[PDB]
Amino acid sequence: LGAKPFGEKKFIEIKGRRMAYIDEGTGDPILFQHGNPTSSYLWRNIMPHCAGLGRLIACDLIGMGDSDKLDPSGPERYAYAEHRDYLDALWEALDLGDRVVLVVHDWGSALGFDWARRHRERVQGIAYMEAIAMPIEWADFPEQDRDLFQAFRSQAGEELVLQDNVFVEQVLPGLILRPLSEAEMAAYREPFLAAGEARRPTLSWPRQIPIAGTPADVVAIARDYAGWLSESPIPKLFINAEPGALTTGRMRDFCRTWPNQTEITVAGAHFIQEDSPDEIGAAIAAFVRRLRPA
Ligand SMILES: [Ca+2]
Ligand SMILES: [Ca+2]
Ligand SMILES: [Ca+2]
Ligand SMILES: [Cl-]
Known part of the structure; x- marks a missing residue:
């Protein structure tokens, strides 16, 4: 597309x-x-489907996309709590009002689910896919990349990511079913062209995933939003993926218990926006049209 x-x-x-x-x-x-x-580039072929339905916003997380890096950077930087401080402040500055629809993926879902729990009166609807919906265990983590993610969460992570850019160059293409073009990979590589700390966000992130009880702060945050989402009557759109990756197994079983939720299934692994953007865009637009009738 x-x-x-x-x-x-x-x-x-x-x-x-x-x-x-x-x-x-x-x-x-x-x-x-x-x-x-x-x-924000991830959503480039999805956002068009929502033309005229609202104010279409896609933010670049701190240290990512065209957002500034956080210097001095190091192993303590770009944890979930720091990302949340920046994103909360950006969302406040954008004057979003009190009928927001969230469309979230991966760490964007942890951030968005947590924000929604804290700002629930302002949330009109939540569309999610390949999300971090609850704390998990290693057995729940997709088998293909389990050992690699364990390596990220070890002293080996700096060489893998900071030196060799493995998250961008291996994980990303490896979890997209169709071949990416030169230009698409260039857009994903651009914020991370320089070796070293420029790539730190892409290492800190896997180190933050709430798996096997650590990090305990993120585990607690995800436990909180998991409990809340499982009871909340806010309208939800679950875009399931086949084969999918993260939102499979027990996590998917849990997501399917959430109230007031519609589900569709699209082809994809993790970065499903690159495999099924029109299906995804069409589903989101239909969800928004139902939430915002004339
Ligand atoms: Ca209004
Ligand atoms: Ca292993
Ligand atoms: Ca190397
Ligand atoms: Cl990650």
């Missing part, structure tokens, strides 16, 4: 750093949040 980005990038200063985002159209927001190691 295409390598061209959607909209043009806008910038805003947050906590002394410049963050980048797309913000197109008018009305109540439809807020698309990427995870690791992507950016």
